[PDB]
From Swiss-Prot:
The reverse transcriptase is an error-prone enzyme that lacks a proof-reading function. High mutations rate is a direct consequence of this characteristic. RT also displays frequent template switching leading to high recombination rate. Recombination mostly occurs between homologous regions of the two copackaged RNA genomes. If these two RNA molecules derive from different viral strains, reverse transcription will give rise to highly recombinated proviral DNAs. It comes from Moloney murine leukemia virus (isolate Shinnick). Residues 59-247 form the Reverse transcriptase domain. Mg(2+) 1 binds at residues 124, 198-199. The reverse transcriptase is a monomer (Potential). Interacts (via RNase domains) with host release factor ETF1; this interaction is essential for translational readthrough of amber codon between viral gag and pol genes, as well as for viral replication. Its cofactor is Mn(2+); Mg(2+). RNA binds at residues 41, 88, 90, 104, 168, 170. This is Reverse transcriptase/ribonuclease H. Disulfide bonds: none annotated. Binds 2 Mn(2+)/Mg(2+) ions for ribonuclease H (RNase H) activity. RT is a multifunctional enzyme that converts the viral dimeric RNA genome into dsDNA in the cytoplasm, shortly after virus entry into the cell. This enzyme displays a DNA polymerase activity that can copy either DNA or RNA templates, and a ribonuclease H (RNase H) activity that cleaves the RNA strand of RNA-DNA heteroduplexes in a partially processive 3' to 5' endonucleasic mode. Conversion of viral genomic RNA into dsDNA requires many steps. A tRNA binds to the primer-binding site (PBS) situated at the 5' end of the viral RNA.
Length: 252
DNA sequence: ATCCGTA
DNA sequence: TAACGGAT
């Protein structure tokens, strides 16, 4: 199967990703920016318990590390009745220098799919932002408080990877992956590759070309340190769901 | 929690 | 202005 020929390429079988060719990201602040320290709002035990194993996992993965920083933003519990950690990074976002929004809207992106290429593969990358390292100098920006009263735990944690909730993550990820896949595009002139942050579409003129192109794309992604979702993967189909659209016969 | 945008 | 939906 596809899952066994490319074990490195799938979130299921490859372990965590890390885009090794991408230098750790440095996040420039606006000229007048001063650190902001917002106090953590008290969390109910239910929400704390709901969130705890997620925090523990990220610590075990090295994605969260202890720290002490002049920046602090609130951790929110967000619920299905399962709680997930959602950091409110809005006051950090306002203080970070703006970048040009280079991710195309899906309409314009799909306008680049010729009707000549009707064999499709759709892959989405698992925990994409977490594959990009954050430079130690910018890590402090994203600190929050983790207090576990019934374990005598207090202190800040922060991210070593590009974080959810950060206004520039989607754009920075899209740009990083474009740099990492540029050569692939060069080696495969006959293929169409659409990238929308972590959502990929490969289109080919024939099923053979799609099979051979998908193999090469999976191999490339795994080698670069990215991980595709095998569960959601749509491989060499005449019809696929991409970015809310149904792609079929060159339509949509 | 807090911030932004329809009767 | 109260109220809500959606966002972090």
């Amino acid at each position: 199967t596809w899952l066994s020929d490319f074990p490195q390429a799938w979130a299921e079988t490859g372990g965590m990703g890390l885009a090794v060719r991408q230098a750790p990201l440095i996040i420039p602040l606006k000229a007048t920016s001063t650190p902001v320290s917002i106090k953590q709002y008290p969390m109910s035990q239910e929400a704390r318990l709901g969130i705890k194993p997620h925090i523990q996992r990220l610590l075990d993965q090295g994605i969260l590390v202890p720290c002490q920083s002049p920046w602090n933003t609130p951790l929110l519990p967000v619920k299905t009745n399962d709680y997930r950690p959602v950091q409110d990074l809005r006051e950090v976002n306002k203080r970070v220098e703006d970048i040009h929004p280079t991710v195309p809207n899906p309409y314009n992106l799909l306008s680049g799919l010729p009707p000549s290429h009707q064999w499709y593969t759709v892959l989405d990358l698992k925990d994409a932002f977490f594959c990009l390292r954050l430079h130690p100098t910018s890590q402090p920006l994203f600190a929050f408080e983790w207090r576990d009263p019934e374990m005598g735990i207090s202190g800040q944690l922060t991210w070593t990877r590009l974080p959810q909730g950060f206004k520039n993550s989607p754009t920075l990820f899209d740009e990083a992956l474009h740099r990492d896949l540029a050569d692939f595009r060069i080696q495969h002139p006959d293929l169409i590759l659409l990238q929308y942050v972590d959502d990929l579409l490969l289109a080919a003129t024939s099923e053979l070309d799609c099979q051979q192109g998908t193999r090469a794309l999976l191999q490339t992604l795994g080698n670069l340190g990215y991980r595709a979702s095998a569960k959601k993967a749509q491989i060499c189909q005449k019809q696929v769901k991409y970015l809310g659209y149904l792609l079929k016969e060159g339509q949509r």
